[PDB]
Each structure stands twice: as C-alpha cells, then as structure tokens.
Design a protein around this ligand. Structure first.
Ligand SMILES: Nc1nc2c(ncn2[C@@H]2O[C@H](COP(=O)(O)OP(=O)(O)OP(=O)(O)O)[C@@H](O)[C@H]2O)c(=O)[nH]1
Ligand SMILES: [Mg+2]
Lengths: 283, 174, 74, 104, 140, 247, 123
RNA sequence: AGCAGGCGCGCAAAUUACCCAAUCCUAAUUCAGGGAGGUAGUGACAAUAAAUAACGAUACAGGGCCCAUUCGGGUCUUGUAAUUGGAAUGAGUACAAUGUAAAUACCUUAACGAGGAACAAUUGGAGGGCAAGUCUGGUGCCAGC
C-alpha cells in the first residue's frame, strides 16, 4: 500500500498562507446565526448562552460576547433574515456560521443566498443546524428528511459537514443534550486562514455612543453631522494606531478615524495572567 | 458470495449480440442476469467435467452424478430420458434460463407477452400454489410447474377489484 | 409570504443533453433494441414469418431472373 | 509513478499560459503553469474546455492528474502530460457542468 | 519537502517578527504596529451623518474594515462576470446592480464586454447565458 | 467467558448470540461433558431460554444421580442418570453412532444405579483401601480384586458397590472418545504396549476388528447381556449407504 | 373469518405449561390481534386469559397466515411466578418503569460510591 | 487502559443513542450487575433480490425504411401521430395490528396514493448542421481553427 501511503499525504500540501492571529490575546471568533425568518435564531442564542454561562437572556439584541472554555471566548450575532444589507456583510465578517434550516420545510432561499455569498466571498466554517423536527411519528419520514437534507447540504457546502438536528423547544430553550454536543464542537472549532480577513483590519461594533454636545445639537436643530464613538472589538490585521486611517463602516460609506483608545478588556484572560462571564452590551 | 462473474472479455461483437438476443427474447433487465445464470451453468458443468474425467464404477462418480442429475431434473432443465452424466456436459444456457418464472408463466399462458409477464409477477399476482412470488428469477422446479395461477388476493384472481377500477366506478357512478 | 426553493435548485442538476424516456428503464431499452434488430434481419436473410397466411396471393414483392442466392461448393 | 508514487498532486498555478492565443479552444490557449508542491517544481498542465479555463486564476491550489491521449489529434501539442481534474476543492467537470460552486 | 519549507519560512518570519516585537511598549505596541488583535477599543469619527444615530437599530450589525492605500481611489475596474446559474433571467448591459466588491456595497452600471478572439474589446448587448465575460464599471 | 468455539458435539445454534456456556468444575472434563443448560435448552427443548432453565433448576425438579445439584453450569458428563421427578423421566445420557449425547428413557429399576470405569485403586489414609471412578466418586472399601481400568456398579442410594465386571479377554465393552465412538463387542485381540496406544479389539455383528486408546474404552458386562441399555438398535454404524440400499 | 390451529404441543410440568406452535390463518385481514387471539386461545383451551401467552409471531410472505410460539399455563399465580417481567408488562397485570434509566442511574451510582456519608451533612 | 466523541495541518465521514430482552459471566448468589454482549441510528467499502412502466384501439404518411469495401440486396409484415381507451400496481402516505427490553425496519393492511404516469435515471461516448458574427493563412468565390 505504498501507493496509498504516497497518495493520502497529498491532502496536507496546500497553498502557503499567512495568519496574523497572535497567541497572546486572540479575539472572540465571531459566529453568525443566520437563516430563515421565524425559525431558530433567538431560541438557539438563548439556549447557547444558557448552557455556556448558566444564565438566561430575555429580549436579546445586538452582538453578545460570551466565554466558552478556558482560554478564548466567542461572539454571537442574530443576523436579521430580511435584508441582504445585513446578510452580505455578516458573510463578509463572519468566521464560523451556525446556519439554520427547518426540516419541516426543506431548504429556503435566504440560507441559499447566504451560502452562495459565503462561497464567493471566502468560505467560513459552516455548520448546519436542522431544527423544527415536529415532522411526524413516522420515523421513516424523519430519517428521510434528515437524509435528503444531509445530502443536499453536503453538496452545497463541503461534503462531510456536521448537521446537528434539534427537536422541539422545551419552554424557551432547546434540548440541552443537543446544545451540549454542539457547544463541545464550537469549543473544538479549529478555524482556518482567509486572505480578506488576513489583509484587512476589521471590527464588529458592539457598543455605539454619540459623544456630541447636547447644547450644540439643541442650538443647531437636528442638522449636524455629529461625532460618534464606536466602542468595538477589532479582529484581523493590526488597525494602525495613528489617526487619519480611512475606515469604511458598512452601509453609510467610509470615514477617517479621529482618535482611538485601548480599553480594559471586558472578557477573561486566564486567571494567572489576571493575577500576575457573559458580557452582553447594547442591552 | 459473489455469484456473477465478468466473462473472459466483456466488449466483443459476438458477446454483444448474444446478450442482445437473449435479453430481448426472454425479457431480461441487464447483463447481470445472463451472467448469473451463465456462471452457475459453468460451475455445474465444470463440476461435471471432473466426474466425467474420472473412471466409471467409482462411488464418487456414481452417486455424485446421481446427485447432480437428481438436482438438475428437479430444476427441470434435463429431460426424463437423458439421465446420464454427459448430457449435463451438453447442457446450454437457453433451456437453463427458460425455467425462470417470467418465461414460464408466459409459456403457461395468462400473460400475452414476456414483458407483461414480468411486470405482473412483480406487481404481485402469480402464486405457485400458496406462496405469492414477487420475483422473476425463480427457476421453478418441475413438480410445481402446474401450480401457477393468479393469487386469490389479487384482482386478476378473485379478489376485490383494484384501486383504479373502484375509483373509476366511484367517479363514474357519481 | 414565505419563500421556497424551486425544482432545479432542489435537484441541483443542469446543462445536460436531452436524455431519453427509452433510456430510463433498462428493460425497455433492451426491448426497443431487440425489436428493431428483430426487424433489421428482415434485410439480411429472409426469416420464417408463419408461412402462407391468407390464400396464395403470389409472392407479392418481385421475383428476378438473374439472381441466385445459393451458396456453392467452390 | 509520474511524480514519485502518487496519482494526483496538489499544485499552485503561476499564470494562465497563452491568454493571447487568438484561436479559441486551442492547445496553446489551454495551458497553465502549475507549481507542483510535492517537490516544488514547474509543470505545464492542460485544462480542458477554454470556456471553463477561466475558473482558475492564480494560486487556486489546483489538483492535477495525467492526460493519456487515446490516439492522435489535429493540432494538439505534445509535452503536456498533466490535466486539471480538481480546482480548490471542487472538480472542474462539475464546475463546467455548473452543479457545484467554486469556493474562495 | 517544499510545502514544509514554505511553512517553515513564513513561520520563522512570524517568530522573528514577534521576538523583536516583544520590546518596549509605546513604540512596539501602539506607534509602530498599533493594537494587533483582540483589543476593546473606542473609535471616534466626526462628520458622521444624522440618520445613522437618529434611526440606529440594535438588530443590525455594524462592521467596519480599514482601507489599504489602493482602495480609496476611484475610476473604472475590469472584472469577469457570470450570471449566477439559478437566476432566472440574464443581465442586460447598462442595467444597474448592487455589488459587494470588498467592504463597499454599491449600485453601479456595468458594461459587459468580451474580447472577440482576443484582439479588441467590443460591447455586448447582453451577458452570455451560462459562461463568463469581461465587464467594466465605475466604482471603488 | 471465552466461547463461540464450543465442543461441536454439543450442536448449539450459531445465531444464538455470541458466547457458549462454560462448564464449571465437576466430575467430568471440559470437552467430554454436557451441562444442563445445553441439555435443557437445545437438546430436548423443555425450556426456551437459560434463565428459565435456571428457574427449573432452582425449583428442585431435576436431580442428577441421586441429589438435586441446583446449578446451571454443572458438568454432568457421561453415564450418569438424570431423574426428572416430574415427567417420570430417567434421562441416562449415553453416546451414539455419530458422536453426540444420545438420550434414553430409563426404567426406575435401572435408573436406581449407575456404573463407571475406575481410574486407580489406592491406599488412602490409616491403611484404608479406596478406589476412584471416572466421575470422582472416590469410594472406600472395595473388593480388592478391583483392577485398574475396570467398572464397578454404584448403588446410588448409598455410595456402595453392588457388583463389578472384572474385565479380561472377552466381556462386553463400550467405547467413549475417539473416532470409533459408540461400538460394542470385545473379542478379537487384546494388545498391551508400554505407554498406551493399545486396545481390546472389537467384534460386532459385522465383526469389525477395531482399536483405539485404552483410556478411550470401558466395560459394560457379559456378551449379549449388558448392564446398560443402548440407543437406537444398540449402535453399530453399519453404513448409511447400505441402509438406503436395503430399506 | 380467521382460524387458529396449534401444533407441536408438548406438555411441560416442569413449569406446568403447555408449549406449542400457533398457526393463525386469516384470509383477508391484516393480523390476528394478540389480545383477541389470547382470549380465543384461552376459550378453546381451559385457561384464564391471564395464564395464556403468545409472543413469537411473524406473518409469512404474501399475507394470509402467521406463525408464532404459544404458551398456556395453569394456576394464574404460577403464571405470575414464571413468566418474565417484559411479558408480564406487555399484558396488563404487573408494571415496571423506573426513571433512572442508564446515564442518570450510573452517574448516581458512581457519585453515591463517592459519597460514603449518610444524611449527617452540616456545613 | 476499553466505548462513545474529539485532537492528530488551514481542506473533512458513524452516536458523546437504547438496554440487560437474548448468549454468557461474576457475586452472599433465580432477583443485583456487565460500553463483555445485544438493539437502533449513520453507512454506494462490499454482497444478494429488482421498481422507474404493461396491454390495446385509431389516424394519416409512403419523394419510405434497413443492410453490405459501390454500382447490389430485401421489405409497410415501417415510421410518425397526447387523435385514444381503460385495467394493474408499489415508491410513498397512513388508520391499526405485528415485531421488540421499548421503539425503528421488514413481514401484514383498512382509507388515500399516475399520466408529461412532472410520483421527473444517471454516467459517459461518436457525429453533425446553422449567422448580415468573430479570427488566422492565400495562387479571387478558398482552406483551417
Ligand atoms: N415545535 C417547535 N417550535 C419551534 C422550534 N424551533 C422554533 N420554534 C418556534 O418558533 C418560534 C420563534 O422562535 P425564534 O426562532 O427564536 O424566533 P426568532 O429567532 O427571533 O426569529 P425571528 O422572529 O424571525 O427573528 C418559537 O416561539 C418556537 O415556538 C422547534 O424546533 N419545534
Ligand atoms: Mg428574532
């Protein structure tokens, strides 16, 4: 089997790429719950935060940064399922995508458009979550829908991807066994380098304040192009600290930075580096 | 197991016309059916060649040849008069696959074509005495050749008429 | 007001030649190949087709004088 | 055997060889310069169907295989021993018949 | 082999980069390389328009990417294009469409062209039905 | 719990799980005994599954050669009796023409005793002569004309000896073990090497002069008058081809 | 109309049962409805409808007949004492369901092996 | 130091399921237990069985069919038409029963379930032909890609 021994170690050899993800303060890997309207997202977010920090979250909004495991943390984002103007830049920023399908309906064209946008703009780690298995007692049809969805999904994304199935919701949160065997996977995540997120300094905003003078807006009369503080969390290549950098935030057009400032970290490092925990802003 | 075997060459003109004639004559599905019947024919007459090449009056040749001809007359591919061992050597694939249930119910009648025979006995209508057989490749034994009739729980026998007939009776009696 | 996916995106095929309803079921294609080749060799031999069916209406298709389809012994 | 023992080798495309060939679907148009990774060398691969040449652009981590002509053609060049069978994870036959989608 | 040679090259580059980064803090953290990765930072922008803060919604994400020195200039750009194979209708030239070219997303008017056997670039009145073609448009 | 290659004269079903029963320590060896699980589960089929066999063993219905022996894996091997008090049954398990454990339905007056070959005659303690037998019933005070490789007739109410068959040239014999199993008749030749490989040769209705190891043979009684009954025509193995030629 | 027919009947006073093979023949119906079968078998024998048991059914191919195994006891108390619990809960006479199934039972077993203490627990 | 799930590079395949019901085994010992073991899920590695259609009726058409290095040979008993008709079904779907430790599957089975039977079979391979179109060569109107 020397031919197989020389033929299966060609899986290793790829294009050499560079990473720039330093091993001292790795960012929360932004994952992005996206899919159809209605099904999934908010209850899956509530289940993941209830199993990762043992505390519920009612009326969630905006990006959370929860902690999972010892070293590193991660970031959730309920992307709205009605606009490509959020779907596109979520697929441009995201690193994992736990992607919702509903098995009593087949696929849906919002997750179709999301998977095509991801396939073009640079493949994140995709992971399918097939929810809504209120199908019937006919476990033959349950196995049939899961089999056809798995084969269609493995054609659409890489063949062999994980497709976690969820049953019905037990009073707001998902079945905790399935949330356990999903959370163990996204703790053993193992991401990959991509050229766009290793060539551009990119940041997801999670707090948004307007430090413009109230007397000034009250004497100008709702006309000014104000000044705005984005309290956020950068990923990727180092955003250069000198003010004057052109930074485009999405959906309004570009600006230049005025001043930036490093803050106390609102998420855990290891406690030995502390000496020598869900953080849910915009809420 | 590995019943069927690929022949000594599968891309050849005479073999291609062989499979074309046999398939279109006995109403067959693919080359695997001819290859299965041809294989087991080759196996039993390869076993018959050794019993021929050893001498007569050996107990091996005597009652193993009697065993082989009893099994072959039980399947029915050997006539009642040629009960000696070299007619097994002179066997052929045509009167060996002629005893399958498709061809046999077409010969018995009741089907009006070989292909209609195949599609009805896979639509579960023909029962050898008591047992409904829904498979063509049966090789029906000689004793149960006269027990072929439409099964009683099927509307070509004497059951309730089918769903097409009673649905048309409903929406033509409305 | 809920979307769905259509047939070609569900099946994920496309840009193929027009294939054949005869080519679908192999038992049918190995029937419509035989009964053509059954009618092909009414043009290389003259096969037996029952015989004198009606009354003898003549040979009905032409007899020619200068033609001998008899294999001769060298 | 043509490259050590393996039947397929992942490779990095340098540049589409012969974009300026005027005759469409020609031999000098359907070549790419692949950097073989298993020993780090250059080779000239032969992607079929110039209409599906333009999937591969530049370091698309392409996967080669042998060619093996079953006769003699009209204006085919010799020397190309390698054809493209898979590009960046997917198979470009499936890409050219537009089932899958090229990921980037 | 060659791939482990290239990986050893870039990883030794990153290692010597870190080993001469691990130095005095005002230069080597925030004025020679500037907030590497994973730093909760506040940014301010003046001249941000009103409707952003007037009707900001907490549901929608606010991503922000920096620009390289080349991707603030304007002018034409020549891309390759293809009708996405499940779109039921083909793309006529001078019909505007939204693009996710990089960070910016923008409606622009393209012109689909093709090199007629690679001698000149003439304007098509329609995109081809299943294969690629060149295209040119004003944009970032 | 090592199994699935049992002694294949037990004839257990192979699609019956994976394992096969381990006979415990007892009066007979491993591969020449037959435990009551294999007996009452797939040899005469009075109980379906092994825990039901444990139920009929625990409920005192079965006794092997006199006393109850409430145990599943009890290796009740050759020549003993099994007096099922209900069903009035006396299973003596003996051998057959082919190598299996044939059963009987013994009368009570014959099931009241059993026999067996001795293995040694010794002087145990305080100058007491005691003999053994093949099923471990080391019994004291024999008649001292008991020789090695001879049979005594145990009374099975007490452990006393009622009679013995002093084997010599010419008294009716059984066999056990080896490829000449289940044969009778003792009168052709009596060979005695030095180190085994010897037999009292056999004479039957067809007078087949046969031999085996002397460890693989033991006695029954007088010619034509045996002490034990024997199953299915007092097993001979003439020929199945001659049987299908005659009848 | 169906029929039942028993064969291979052997008495067995080692359990005071009679065990046999049951052939039910139904010309058009699906299958023979084990509760109704059980009361019919206890009617044709002299049994209880509680001391008769049938388990190993299989409908043979093409429909029409079904073959299975069949038990009739006597002394309904002895039927309780001899037939296993899964059969005795398939009939409605004795129930057994416990919540600590495998995982929440064995984790409780291992932690209770770790406990070593009774209800004296003051902190 | 085994089961399940992982890691083993950035590009890859089973579940962190059920259970002592079977076979055995251990213990004071029928009764407790056993990731020994069994059951189920996933599973184009392999193997066997075979459904995607079957039978009729009608209409015109013949400058038409088919075969053999060529001229020859033989044939409406040859093709195109929803012109069109009713019959039979299981893939499914599903009361129920069956199986089983319980449950799935199969085996049964009432009521549904077919015309483009769209209830949509693929993978290859050999040829063409078409423009107010494109390109290269030249001994016009051509040859090639
Ligand atoms: N029966 C059943 N209901 C579900 C299941 N999953 C979600 N639902 C229902 O779907 C409803 C919507 O919940 P979410 O999915 O959290 O709503 P959302 O994520 O905010 O989606 P949007 O409102 O469109 O943004 C819930 O109230 C659930 O009752 C499921 O698996 N089974
Ligand atoms: Mg929501």
């Amino acid at each position: 089997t020397m031919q197989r021994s020389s033929d299966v170690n060609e899986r290793k050899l790829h294009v050499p790429m560079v990473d720039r993800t330093p091993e001292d303060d790795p960012p929360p890997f932004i994952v992005a719950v996206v899919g159809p309207p209605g099904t999934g997202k908010t209850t899956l977010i509530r289940s993941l935060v209830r199993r990762m920090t043992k505390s519920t979250l009612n009326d969630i909004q905006g990006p959370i940064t929860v902690v999972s495991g010892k070293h590193r943390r991660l970031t959730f984002l309920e992307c709205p399922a009605d606009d490509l103007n959020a779907m596109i830049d979520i697929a441009k920023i995201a690193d994992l995508v736990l992607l919702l399908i509903d098995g009593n309906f087949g696929f849906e064209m919002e997750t179709m458009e999301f998977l095509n946008i991801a396939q073009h703009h640079g493949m994140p780690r995709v992971l399918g979550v097939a929810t809504h298995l209120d199908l019937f007692k006919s476990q033959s049809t349950l196995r049939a829908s899961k089999k056809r969805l798995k084969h269609r999904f493995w054609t659409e994304v890489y063949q062999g991807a994980k497709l976690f199935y969820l049953s019905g919701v037990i009073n707001g949160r998902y079945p905790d066994r399935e949330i356990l065997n999903l959370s163990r996977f996204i703790s053993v995540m193992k991401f990959r380098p991509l050229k766009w997120r290793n060539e551009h300094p990119y940041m997801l905003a999670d707090r948004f304040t307007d430090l413009t003078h109230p007397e000034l807006i009250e004497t100008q009369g709702l006309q000014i192009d104000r000044k705005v503080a984005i309290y956020g969390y950068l990923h990727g290549t180092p955003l250069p600290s000198a003010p004057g950098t052109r930074v485009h935030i999405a959906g309004v057009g570009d600006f230049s930075v005025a001043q930036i400032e490093k803050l106390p970290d609102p998420c855990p490092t290891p406690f030995y580096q502390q000496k020598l925990l869900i953080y849910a802003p915009m809420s | 197991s590995k019943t069927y075997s690929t022949p000594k060459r599968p891309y050849e003109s005479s073999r291609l016309d062989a499979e074309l004639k046999l398939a279109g004559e006995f109403g067959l599905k693919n080359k695997k059916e001819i290859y299965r019947i041809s294989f087991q024919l080759s196996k039993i007459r390869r076993a018959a060649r050794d019993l021929l090449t050893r001498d007569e009056k050996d107990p091996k040749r005597l009652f193993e040849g009697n065993a082989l001809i009893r099994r072959l007359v039980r399947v029915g591919v050997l006539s009642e008069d040629k009960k000696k061992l070299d007619y097994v050597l002179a066997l052929k694939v045509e009167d060996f696959l002629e005893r399958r249930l498709q061809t046999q119910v077409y010969k018995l009648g009741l089907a009006k074509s070989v292909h209609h025979a195949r599609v009805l006995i896979t639509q579960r209508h023909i029962a050898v005495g008591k047992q409904i057989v829904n498979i063509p490749s049966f090789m029906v034994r000689l004793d149960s050749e006269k027990h072929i009739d439409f099964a009683p729980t099927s509307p070509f026998g004497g059951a309730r008429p089918g769903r097409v007939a009673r649905r048309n009776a409903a929406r033509k009696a409305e | 007001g809920k979307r769905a996916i259509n047939y070609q995106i569900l099946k994920n095929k496309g840009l193929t030649p027009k294939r054949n309803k005869d080519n679908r079921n192999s038992r049918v294609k190995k029937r419509k190949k035989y009964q053509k080749a059954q009618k092909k060799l009414k043009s290389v031999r003259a096969v037996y087709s029952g015989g004198q069916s009606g009354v003898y209406e003549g040979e009905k298709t032409g007899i020619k004088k200068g033609l001998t389809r008899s294999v001769k012994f060298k | 055997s043509p490259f050590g023992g393996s039947s397929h080798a992942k490779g990095i495309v340098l540049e589409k060889l012969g974009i300026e060939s005027k005759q469409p679907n020609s031999a000098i148009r359907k070549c790419v310069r692949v950097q073989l990774i298993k020993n780090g060398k250059k080779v000239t691969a032969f992607v079929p169907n110039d209409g599906c040449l333009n999937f591969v652009d530049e370091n698309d981590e392409v996967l080669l295989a042998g060619f093996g002509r079953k006769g003699k053609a009209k204006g085919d060049i010799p020397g190309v021993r390698f054809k493209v069978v898979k590009v960046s994870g997917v198979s470009l036959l499936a890409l050219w018949k537009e089932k899958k989608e090229k990921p980037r | 082999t060659w791939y482990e040679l290239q990986k050893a090259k870039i990883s030794k580059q990153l290692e010597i980069n870190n080993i001469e980064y691990q130095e005095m803090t005002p230069e080597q953290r925030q004025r020679i390389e500037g907030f590497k990765a994973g730093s909760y930072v506040r940014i301010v922008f003046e001249k941000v328009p009103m409707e952003f803060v007037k009707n900001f919604n907490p549901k929608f994400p606010i991503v922000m990417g920096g620009l390289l020195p080349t991707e603030i200039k304007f002018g034409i750009v020549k891309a390759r294009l293809r009708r996405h194979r499940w779109h039921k209708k083909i793309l006529k030239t001078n019909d505007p469409l939204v693009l996710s070219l990089g960070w910016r997303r923008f409606q622009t008017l393209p012109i689909y062209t093709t090199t007629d056997s690679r001698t000149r670039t003439r304007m098509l009145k329609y995109t081809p039905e299943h294969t690629y073609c060149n295209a040119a448009f004003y944009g970032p | 719990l090592k199994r699935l290659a049992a002694p294949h004269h037990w004839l257990l079903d192979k699609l019956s799980g994976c394992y096969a029963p381990r006979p415990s320590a007892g009066p007979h060896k491993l591969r020449e005994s037959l435990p009551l699980i294999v007996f009452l589960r797939n040899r005469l089929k009075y109980a379906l599954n092994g825990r039901e066999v444990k139920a009929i063993l625990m409920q005192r219905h079965v006794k092997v050669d006199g006393k109850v022996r409430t145990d599943t894996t009890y290796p009740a091997g050759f020549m003993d009796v099994i007096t099922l008090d209900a069903t009035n049954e006396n299973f003596r398990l003996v051998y057959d023409v082919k190598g299996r454990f044939a059963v009987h339905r013994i009368t009570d007056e014959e099931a009241s005793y059993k026999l067996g070959k001795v293995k040694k005659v010794q002087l145990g303690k305080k100058g007491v002569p005691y003999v053994v037998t093949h099923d471990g019933r080391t019994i004291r005070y024999p008649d001292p004309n008991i020789k090695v490789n001879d049979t005594v007739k145990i009374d099975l109410a007490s452990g006393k000896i009622t009679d013995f068959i002093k084997f010599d040239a010419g008294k009716l014999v059984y066999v056990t073990g080896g490829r000449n199993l289940g044969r009778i008749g003792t009168i052709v030749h009596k060979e005695r090497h030095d180190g085994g490989f010897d037999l009292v040769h056999i004479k039957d209705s067809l007078d087949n002069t046969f031999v085996t190891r002397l460890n693989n043979v033991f006695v029954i009684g007088e010619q034509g008058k045996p002490y034990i009954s024997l199953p299915k025509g007092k097993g001979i193995k003439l020929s199945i081809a001659e049987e299908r030629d005659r009848r | 109309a169906v029929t039942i027919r028993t064969r291979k009947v052997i008495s067995n006073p080692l359990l005071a049962r009679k065990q046999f093979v049951v052939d039910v023949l139904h010309p058009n119906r699906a299958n023979v409805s084990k509760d109704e079968l059980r009361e019919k078998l206890a009617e044709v024998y002299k049994a209880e409808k509680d001391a008769v048991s049938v388990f190993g059914f299989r409908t043979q191919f093409g429909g029409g007949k079904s073959v299975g195994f069949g038990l009739v006891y006597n002394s309904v108390a002895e039927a309780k004492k001899f037939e296993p619990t899964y059969r005795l809960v398939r009939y409605g006479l004795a129930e057994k369901v416990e919540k600590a199934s495998r995982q929440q039972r064995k984790q409780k077993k291992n932690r209770d092996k770790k406990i070593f203490g009774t209800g004296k627990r003051l902190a």
